[PDB]
Design a protein around this ligand. Sequence first.
Ligand SMILES: Nc1ccccc1C(=O)OP(=O)(O)OC[C@H]1O[C@@H](n2cnc3c(N)ncnc32)[C@H](O)[C@@H]1O
Length: 516
Amino acid sequence: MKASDLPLYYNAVDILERNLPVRANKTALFTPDREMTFRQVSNEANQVGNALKGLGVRFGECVGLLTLDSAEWVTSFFGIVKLGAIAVGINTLLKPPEYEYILRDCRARVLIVHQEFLPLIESIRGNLPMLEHIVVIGGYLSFNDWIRPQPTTLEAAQSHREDICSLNYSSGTGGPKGIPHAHKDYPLTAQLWGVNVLGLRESDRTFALAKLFFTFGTGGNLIFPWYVGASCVLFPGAARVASNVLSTISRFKPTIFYNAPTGYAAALALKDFSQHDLSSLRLCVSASEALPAALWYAWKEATGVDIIDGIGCTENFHIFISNRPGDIRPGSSGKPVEGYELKLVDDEGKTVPAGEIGNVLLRSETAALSYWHNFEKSRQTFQGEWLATGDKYFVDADGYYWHAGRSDDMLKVGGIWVSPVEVESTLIQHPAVQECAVIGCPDQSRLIKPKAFIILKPEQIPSEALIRQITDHCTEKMAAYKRPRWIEFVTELPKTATGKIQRFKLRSAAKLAAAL
Ligand SMILES: Nc1ccccc1C(=O)OP(=O)(O)OC[C@H]1O[C@@H](n2cnc3c(N)ncnc32)[C@H](O)[C@@H]1O
C-alpha cells in the first residue's frame, strides 16, 4: 500500500482500534502474569491517555517507557500514541548515564518505569530538570492507582499521519541516535511486510524474543499481529535463558516465532531442545543479524519449521528485504519487498555491476525523515528518497541478496575485501561451534588478517584436533585470504540487547592487545 491510501489525519492507535468492537472479547496479549482482550487493552490505554492528561502531557511531547515486555508496556504505548504524545521505548539493559542522556534528549516530563529499574533512574533524578512525574509499575505514582480513577473512554488526537508518534534510541558505535517514526509507518510496515510477505492472519499468534523497545519486536510481536486481529505473547524474563523461551512456546502455543541467529543457536545448543513442544509454530522469523545457512537447516531439521530471514532497521521501522514462505534461500536476506525499492552503489554513489559488493540504498515511505538531535548524521544517512543503512550487500545470479556485513565490519586483506559474515557462516558449519565473530587484526607486520572469536557448544573445551578440524574446514570452504589467521576460543561475546555482536569492541580489544 501507499501513504496516500491512508487518511491525511491518522493515528496509530487504529492498529489496536481497527479490531474494535468485533474482536472485543478475543484475548489480545498473553503474559505469564496477565491476559487481556482487545477491549481490556483499549480501556486501559484510554485510562493511561486520560491519566497522562492529568500530568499535563500534550500532543508532540515525549513520554518515557522503560519496563519489561508486559501488558503495562502495551497499554502505556497505545495510551501515549492515542493522546498524540511521543512514546519513547527505552532499552531495558542500560546504564544510569545512558538513561540520563535519553531522558534529557527527549525532554521527557513523565516516565513510566518498572520498579526494578527505579533505582537506576533515582540516581540520575537531579540531572533531569524536565522530568516531573515518575509512574512506577510493580513517593511515586503506582501504575494501577494512577489509572484507576480515569475513565475508559478517550478521543484520539487529531494527528497528521506524518506526525511523530514514537522515538526509538538505537544503540550506536556513540552514543545512541534517536529515531522518530510517524503514525503512517505503523500500518504501512504492517501491510508491506507483515501481511504481504510474512502472511500474518487473524488466526495467528506471535511470540518474539525481541523486546518491545526493539522495532523488530515492536512490529512483529504487537503492531503487525494486531493489525490483522492476531494475538501476541510477551516474555518479561531474561532472554538469555533459552529453555524458558521454548517453554513459553509450549505453554502459550504461538504460531509465529521471532528471534535472532544468536538466539536460534543458543536454543539448538540445548541438549534437550526437542523436549519442548514447538508444534504450534507454522513459521519462524530471524533478523538483527544474518542467519547462517547452517542454522536454517539445523532448525529445519529439528523442528520442520522454515525460518524467514529478513533485514530491517530502526530507521525503516522494519524489514525491507525478506524471504518468503514460498521462496527461501538459506543464508540470504531473500528478495526485495514490494513497496520498497533497493539500490547497490559504490563508495562514490554509482550502481555497482551485478554480483559485486555495494552499499545499500533503501527507498521507503516508512523510513524516518531524520534523526533526533543528530543534524550531521541525518544528512549522512537520509539521502533524499534513498536511505543508507550502512550495509554491504551483493546479489545472486538468481536475484538473492547476501549480507556481506556492516560497512565497518568489512576487513581488507591484501587489498581484497573480506566479508566477516561469509567467514562466520563457514565457521558455524562445524558442529562444535555455537556462534562466532570475525574481525580484522594487524599481524605484527601490521597487515590486517582475519581473527575468529569462537564460542563452543556447552561443556566443550578446545583441543589440538578441534583447532585442526576448524582450520582444515576453512581451507576447504574459503579462499586463502579469507581464512582466519588466528582462532581464539571464548566463552562469551560482546552483545547488544538486540541480539547483535559488538564487533567494534572486539576490534578495539584486539588492537589494544596487539600493541602489547
Ligand atoms: N529494527 C529492525 C526491524 C526488523 C528487523 C531488524 C531490525 C534491526 O536490527 O534494526 P537495528 O536498528 O537494530 O539495526 C539494523 C542493522 O542490523 C543489521 N541487520 C538487521 N537484520 C538483518 C538481517 N536479517 N541480515 C543481516 N543484517 C541484518 C543490518 O546491518 C542493519 O543495518
